[PDB]
Design a protein around this ligand. Structure first.
Ligand SMILES: Fc1c(F)c(F)c(Cl)c(F)c1F
Ligand SMILES: [Cl-]
Length: 164
């Protein structure tokens, strides 16, 4: 198990434009195209991302290319964020993956409210951190995924993703 396999489980793989859990146009392995309700806007974003006129369909190779870029962007984003970098640096590699997973899903702006969870994680108060993390819109809207990510933070193991 690793961050790539983990997000592959959580996000799936779809080669045609679809709507994510929030209703937003997305493609591949959870690559958000746009929050715009315009399908044409989404297709434009796709073409720009891929570098060719796609009309809404990509290959597996193309999906994986965007995925690699997105994972990279999430990591580099954490490292440039003053609120996130210290907590990330303090973690082991398994829990770092859990961190990347959250940023991938909600972005740094979607994660600004997790201040208290972040403190608890830096303190390595794993059970308390896990309880605090579940007190969120995130957990309520995507409970099964949140539960997997939270279990990863709680245990520092891949147990929530084995069998998957
Ligand atoms: F390192 C971390 C992050 F970068 C992060 F965004 C969140 Cl929500 C975390 F919970 C965390 F531990
Ligand atoms: Cl389409």
């Amino acid at each position: 198990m690793n961050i790539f396999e983990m997000l592959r489980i959580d996000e799936g793989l779809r080669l045609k434009i679809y709507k994510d859990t929030e209703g937003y146009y997305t493609i591949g392995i959870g690559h958000l195209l746009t929050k715009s309700p315009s399908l044409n806007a989404a297709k434009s974003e796709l073409d720009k991302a891929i570098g060719r006129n796609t009309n809404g369909v990509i290959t597996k190779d193309e999906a994986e290319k965007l995925f690699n870029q997105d994972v990279d962007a999430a990591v580099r984003g954490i490292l440039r964020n003053a609120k996130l970098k210290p907590v990330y640096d303090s973690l082991d590699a398994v829990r770092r993956a859990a961190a990347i997973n959250m940023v991938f899903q909600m972005g740094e702006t979607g994660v600004a409210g997790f201040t208290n969870s972040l403190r608890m994680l830096q303190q390595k108060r794993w059970d308390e951190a896990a309880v605090n993390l579940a007190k969120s819109r995130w957990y309520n809207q995507t409970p099964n995924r949140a539960k997997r990510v939270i279990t990863t933070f709680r245990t520092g193991t891949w147990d929530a993703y084995k069998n998957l």
